[PDB]
Design a protein around this ligand. Structure first.
Ligand SMILES: NC(=O)c1cn([C@@H]2O[C@H](CO)[C@@H](O)[C@H]2O)c2ncnc(N)c12
Ligand SMILES: [K+]
Length: 538
């Protein structure tokens, strides 16, 4: 056993767990400025209700805490809250939970009577509940409320100390990000132009994965657009099954993408480097469903992936999964196909192997590639440790068809072949239906996709918190360190465009999640102005 491996792993594990790993001077690092400093932010901030009072979490929570001051608004907040409950109550008890809300917000004498909805809608929605319940029953009601809260109540929040306080938080969000903000841990993987590392924000202690993009490697491979595209794309997609981007900065030697951290290890590892090859069909189904949901969301944004292999699918702490390394994805101009001989060997669709124009098709080819591999324990066109020169694998994918065993259930066998069809025209999901056509296949039977996309299905396999499901640090491949390249000032523009600092909404979640927002967001006694917000005197 190499100590270089033991140490690398035990260090990471301590961080993963006093102070939840925070730095010692976090209260000073994240100290609010005096409100007088936020005049540029007071002007530049765009005054949108959903953004400032909903989409941006801290804005949302400060508005709610502000609504708790006016009794006439705390009810609307509790109403939309109750609606949230009704919208996640089971179809079985939808009618009942529909009943408590109704007797609570709609009678003129209800204790939490809200009058701003409209006496017509209460009756329209009342008959709909007497008829039959639907989770989208109060959709119009909650909309009618949002029409009112966005009016007078919204501008009242903007005038109070709570929105003033939100400016202070946004001042922190704007703060520059540097290597200092984080501490680097063991390497988690090689890929693309750099390495993926565990790191931890010193101030907050939140764990992330730092996908490094080594500058010299970008210049040497003309992959400038490929690196940049990955960054924006990671930003544009906002999905439960895709790594979300939290920071993006520059260093003396690399550009960096700070992404959600996936401590369960990648699926390539769970298939070959743990227990018997592959895992039970139960496990394959759950993960395959989530991969589907991720691909449908990626395609909703009109974006292909082209890089689907187990090594780029990761497992989180609870057993859910997300897609990684979106550096091979491109957004498609609508009504056009692209020619690109890119991808990894044996995970390329026949169109991509023939340098033929394609659209969203090669993604469903990959979905089949993974499902077969999870259950069969090997690529559908390549062995386990099989040494094959690429030319043949290429041939096999185009000429030869896959082979199934008794391990495949009737449904598992079927969904593979329909996804592993050489003709892109007759490929499952590649029809106009899209990912819907796949959501049906009996393979995903008793797989309530609507309930999975919520997250109410427990993963079958739960990674143990005290396990690093990754190759040991000394077993991670390295590059042939690029040297003799010299970075010119011509690239400082791209470095600037790439390094956009923190991502607004994610940063706020970190402050909320790390309880930094909870501990810091306090006010004077009896709900009075603290000193940082009083511009009259100290
Ligand atoms: N941003 C990424 O792409 C990630 C890559 N790895 C690991 O590092 C390897 C190199 O990409 C992968 O196969 C995973 O084992 C990751 N592990 C956790 N979270 C992540 N976001 C990644
Ligand atoms: K296994």
């Amino acid at each position: 056993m190499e100590l270089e491996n033991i140490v690398a792993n035990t260090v990471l594990l301590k961080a993963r767990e006093k102070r939840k790993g925070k730095s010692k001077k976090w209260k000073e690092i994240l100290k609010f400025p005096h409100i007088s400093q936020c005049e540029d932010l007071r002007r530049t901030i765009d005054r949108d209700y959903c953004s400032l009072c909903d989409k941006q979490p801290i804005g949302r929570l400060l508005f709610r805490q502000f609504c708790e001051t006016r009794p006439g608004l705390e009810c609307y907040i509790q109403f939309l809250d109750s609606v949230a409950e009704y919208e996640v109550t089971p179809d079985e008890k939808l009618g009942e939970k529909g009943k408590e809300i109704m007797t609570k917000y709609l009678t003129p004498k209800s204790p939490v009577f809200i009058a701003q909805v409209g006496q017509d809608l209460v009756s329209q929605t009342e008959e709909k509940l007497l008829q039959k319940p639907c989770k989208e029953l109060f959709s119009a009601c909650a909309q009618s409320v949002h029409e009112y809260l966005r009016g007078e109540p919204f501008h009242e929040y903007l005038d109070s100390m709570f929105f003033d306080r939100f400016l202070q938080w946004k001042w922190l969000e704007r703060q520059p990000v540097t290597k200092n903000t984080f501490r680097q841990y063991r390497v988690l993987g090689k890929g693309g132009f750099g390495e993926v590392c565990a790191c931890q924000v010193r101030a907050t202690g939140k764990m992330y994965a730092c996908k490094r993009l080594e500058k010299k490697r970008i210049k040497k491979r003309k992959g400038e657009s490929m690196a940049l595209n990955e960054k924006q794309i990671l930003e544009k997609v906002n999905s439960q099954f895709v790594v979300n981007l939290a920071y993006a900065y520059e260093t003396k030697d690399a550009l960096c993408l700070v992404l959600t951290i996936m401590n369960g290890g990648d699926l390539k590892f769970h298939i070959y480097n743990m227990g018997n090859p592959g895992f039970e069909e139960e496990r394959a189904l759950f993960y395959a469903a989530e991969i589907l949901c991720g691909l449908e969301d990626l395609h909703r944004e009109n974006t292909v992936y082209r890089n689907l292999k187990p090594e780029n699918i990761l497992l989180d702490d609870y057993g859910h999964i997300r897609i990684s390394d979106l550096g091979l994805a491109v957004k498609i101009p609508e009504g056009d196909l692209i020619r690109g001989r890119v991808g990894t060997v044996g995970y390329m669709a026949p169109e991509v192997l023939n340098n033929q124009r394609y659209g969203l098709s090669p993604d469903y080819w990959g979905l089949g590639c993974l499902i077969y591999e999870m259950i069969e324990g090997q690529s559908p066109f390549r062995g386990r440790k099989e040494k094959v020169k690429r030319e043949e694998v290429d041939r096999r994918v185009l000429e030869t068809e896959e082979v199934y065993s008794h391990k495949f259930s009737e449904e598992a066998k079927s969904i593979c072949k329909m996804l592993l069809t050489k003709d892109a025209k007759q490929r499952l999901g590649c029809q106009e239906e899209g990912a819907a056509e796949v959501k049906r296949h009996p393979f995903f039977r008793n797989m309530n996709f609507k309930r999975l996309e919520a997250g109410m299905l427990d993963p079958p396999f739960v990674p143990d918190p005290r396990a690093v499901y990754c190759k040991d640090v000394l077993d991670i491949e390295q590059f042939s360190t690029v040297k003799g390249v010299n970075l010119d000032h011509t690239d400082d523009d791209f470095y600037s465009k790439f390094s956009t600092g923190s991502v607004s909404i994610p940063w706020q979640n970190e402050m909320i999640e790390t309880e930094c927002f909870k501990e810091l967001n306090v006010f004077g006694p009896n709900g009075t102005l603290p000193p940082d917000l009083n511009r009259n005197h100290p």
